[PDB]
Design a protein around this ligand. Structure first.
Ligand SMILES: [Fe+3]
Length: 324
């Protein structure tokens, strides 16, 4: 048999093939590759059996856990260090040092988000900012409220059609502008951070580690700072004390009925021992070629953690809390 993996892009498919070929050479548990174009296509594919697994950000574990998919998280990615490992991360608001505006004075500013309906880039900041959005609930789409709040933004995935302001700072070329893919350079964590660094925006909504990952030199990282919820600004290393929310890690999702939770688990368990962190000069399960990022799994992940059975998206996600 084979656990069929779901890729949301060619480079992700490319890496999937290499993964398959290395599991073979090593005589390990088999993996196969399906190529889709988005988290949704993969969510359906799995639901309808053309695939078994895909790693998802919390806002998508949310959407999958719903009918008609009823998908369930199976393994969580692990962050941190081997020494201090964790299966959650911090949604922060990163800004340029020098400014004076606080979390509560963002009206009319320009923003950079990881992507529409993602945790750190959308769901968390938007729920936080809500008391200032003056949003006249349904039927009125939140994006409509958001577009009138920030002057211009980069929200990979937003409907440029009805919300051009949300795609305004985006850097993609042509039809790719504001695409929820890597064809849009300001997509995801690293791209949301680049949008801040390029000075397209004033605030980037990302996770804690991005600045450390994207900036090796400690000097440069001193140019940045974070917006805390008590309306203060703190240095970058202070995320523990200054964050908008604490969130469960991205997780591998599978069917709730005949998902193959066990095959998936053994494949991940062995791939991690064989090609995990610092294990093989030939293949890195957590590592992307230059130009790409977070292909299949997060690049800085150190491993996986199995999620106990029958545990639904609901309880998985219920782990998190909005800055209290
Ligand atoms: Fe995330």
């Amino acid at each position: 048999r084979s656990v069929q993996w779901c890729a949301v892009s060619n480079p992700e498919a490319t890496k999937c093939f290499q993964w398959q070929r290395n599991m073979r050479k090593v005589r390990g548990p088999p993996v196969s590759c399906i190529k889709r174009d988005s988290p949704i296509q993969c969510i359906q594919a799995i639901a309808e059996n053309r695939a078994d697994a895909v790693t998802l950000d919390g806002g998508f574990i949310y959407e999958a856990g719903l009918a008609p998919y009823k998908l369930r998280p199976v393994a969580a990615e692990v962050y941190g260090t081997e020494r201090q490992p964790r299966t959650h991360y911090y949604a922060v608001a990163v800004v340029k040092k020098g400014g004076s505006f606080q979390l509560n004075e963002l009206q009319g500013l320009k923003s950079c988000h990881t992507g529409l309906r993602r945790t750190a880039g959308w769901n968390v900041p938007i729920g936080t900012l809500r008391p200032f959005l003056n949003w006249t609930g349904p039927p009125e789409p939140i994006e409509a409220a958001v577009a009138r709040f920030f002057s211009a933004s980069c929200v990979p995935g937003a409907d440029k059609g009805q919300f051009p302001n949300l795609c305004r700072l985006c850097a993609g070329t042509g039809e790719n502008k504001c695409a929820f893919s890597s064809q849009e350079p300001y997509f995801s964590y690293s791209g949301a951070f680049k949008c801040l660094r390029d000075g397209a925006g004033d605030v980037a909504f990302i996770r804690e580690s991005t600045v450390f990952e994207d900036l090796s030199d400690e000097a440069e990282r001193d140019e940045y700072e974070l917006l805390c919820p008590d309306n203060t600004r703190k240095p970058v290393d202070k995320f523990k004390d200054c964050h908008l929310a604490r969130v469960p890690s991205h997780a591998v999702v599978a069917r709730s009925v005949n998902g193959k939770e066990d095959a998936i688990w053994n494949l991940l368990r062995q791939a991690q021992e064989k090609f995990g962190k610092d294990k093989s000069p030939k293949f890195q399960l957590f590592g992307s070629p230059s130009g790409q990022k977070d292909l299949l799994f997060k690049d800085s992940a150190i491993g996986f953690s199995r999620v106990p059975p029958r545990i639904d998206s609901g309880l998985y996600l219920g782990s998190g809390y909005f800055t209290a």
